[PDB]
Paper text:
Ricin is a well-known type 2 ribosome-inactivating protein (RIP) discovered in the late 19th century in the seeds of Ricinus communis. Ricin hydrolyzes the N-glycosidic bond at adenine−4324 in the 28S rRNA of eukaryotic ribosomes. RTA can specifically recognize and bind to the C-terminus of human ribosomal stalk protein both in vitro and in vivo to facilitate its ribosome-inactivating activity.
For C9-P2 and C11-P2 peptide, only the last 6 residues (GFGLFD, C6-P2) could be fitted to the observed electron density, while N-terminal residues DDM and SDDDM were not defined in the final model. The C6-P2 peptide binds to the C-terminal domain of RTA, which is composed of 11 key residues Q182, Y183, S203, L207, Q233, R234, R235, F240, I247, P250 and I251, providing a major hydrophobic interface via main-chain and side-chain interactions, while only R235 contributing one key hydrogen bond contact for C6-P2 peptide binding. The P2 binding pocket of RTA is hydrophobic and is composed of six hydrophobic residues (Y183, L207, F240, I247, P250 and I251) and five polar residues (Q182, S203, Q233, R234 and R235) to form non-bond contacts to accommodate C6-P2 peptide. Our structure of RTA-C9-P2 only captured the electron density of C6-P2; this may be caused by the flexibility of the N-terminal of P2, which was also observed in our previous structural study of TCS-C11-P2 complex.
Numbering used by the authors:
A (entry chain C): 2 to 7
B (entry chain A): 6 to 260
């Protein structure tokens, strides 16, 4: 779920 | 108060991960969870004997310091090294009274002139968060620095840099699975590096996130909250779902 920052 | 221990000596991804999970598990009761996100205890009415948790850090140098964290915001309010304890300048009388209950058997107590907010620490350190490396090497250094402030060996700018390292690798990592993740990656690859804008902007927005989620309309935000990607570009979040993997704890806002 850390994809929003890429 | 409960004591949770971590050592940098022989630290692994699993031992850091388990440490952060223990801190979170001792900060919250787990009874109060909103949108799958745990809420910290409400300051109003919180008995003093439930106010703080202690985090005992040790390192390869065989030195130890104990940080005190306020359970209401997961943030560091002071620390002990040997027979000395040191507290950031409290914001008000009630928080001043509260810290008198910490480290009470220590022979020398000091309250710094400065609070523990980042703008103040970054000025004292002469470096912003984007220019201070994090990781197990920095944390090892930071634990020595806070210890040697009690002996006269650490100067103020290094002490402030060392607070900044500890607060991000402990308090912010407990607040955000994303930030716990950044630290796990540094330990995995045996790297030290500074946080990118995404990390810095989340830290800055934790209180506002807590409020936007808790006052949301069944998860939908009354207005957007701006965050930043790793490359510094801005973007808007409109609802809680996309933040559930990101934020681990919230400051209490409403019943």
């Amino acid at each position: 779920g850390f994809g929003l920052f890429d | 108060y409960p004591i949770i221990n971590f050592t940098t000596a022989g630290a692994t991804v699993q031992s850091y991960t388990n440490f952060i999970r223990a801190v979170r598990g001792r900060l919250t009761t787990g009874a109060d969870v909103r949108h799958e996100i745990p809420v910290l205890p409400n300051r109003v009415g919180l008995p003093i004997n439930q106010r703080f948790i202690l985090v005992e850090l040790s390192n390869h140098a065989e030195l130890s310091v104990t940080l005190a964290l306020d359970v209401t915001n997961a943030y560091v309010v002071g620390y002990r090294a040997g027979n000395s304890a040191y507290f950031f300048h409290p914001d008000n009388q009630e928080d001043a009274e509260a810290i008198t209950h910490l480290f009470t058997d220590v022979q020398n107590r000091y309250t710094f002139a400065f609070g523990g907010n980042y703008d103040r620490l970054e000025q004292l350190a002469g470096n912003l968060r984007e220019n201070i490396e994090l990781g197990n090497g920095p944390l090892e250094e930071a634990i020595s620095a806070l210890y040697y402030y009690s002996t006269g060996g650490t100067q103020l700018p290094t002490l402030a840099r060392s607070f900044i390292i500890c607060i991000q690798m402990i308090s912010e990592a407990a607040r955000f699975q994303y930030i716990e993740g950044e630290m796990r990656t540094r330990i995995r690859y045996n790297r030290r590096s500074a946080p990118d804008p995404s990390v810095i902007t989340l830290e800055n927005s934790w209180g506002r996130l807590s409020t936007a989620i808790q006052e949301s309309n069944q998860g939908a935000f009354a207005s957007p909250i701006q965050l930043q990607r790793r490359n510094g570009s801005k973007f808007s979040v409109y609802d809680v779902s996309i933040l559930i993997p990101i934020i681990a704890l919230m400051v209490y806002r409403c019943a």
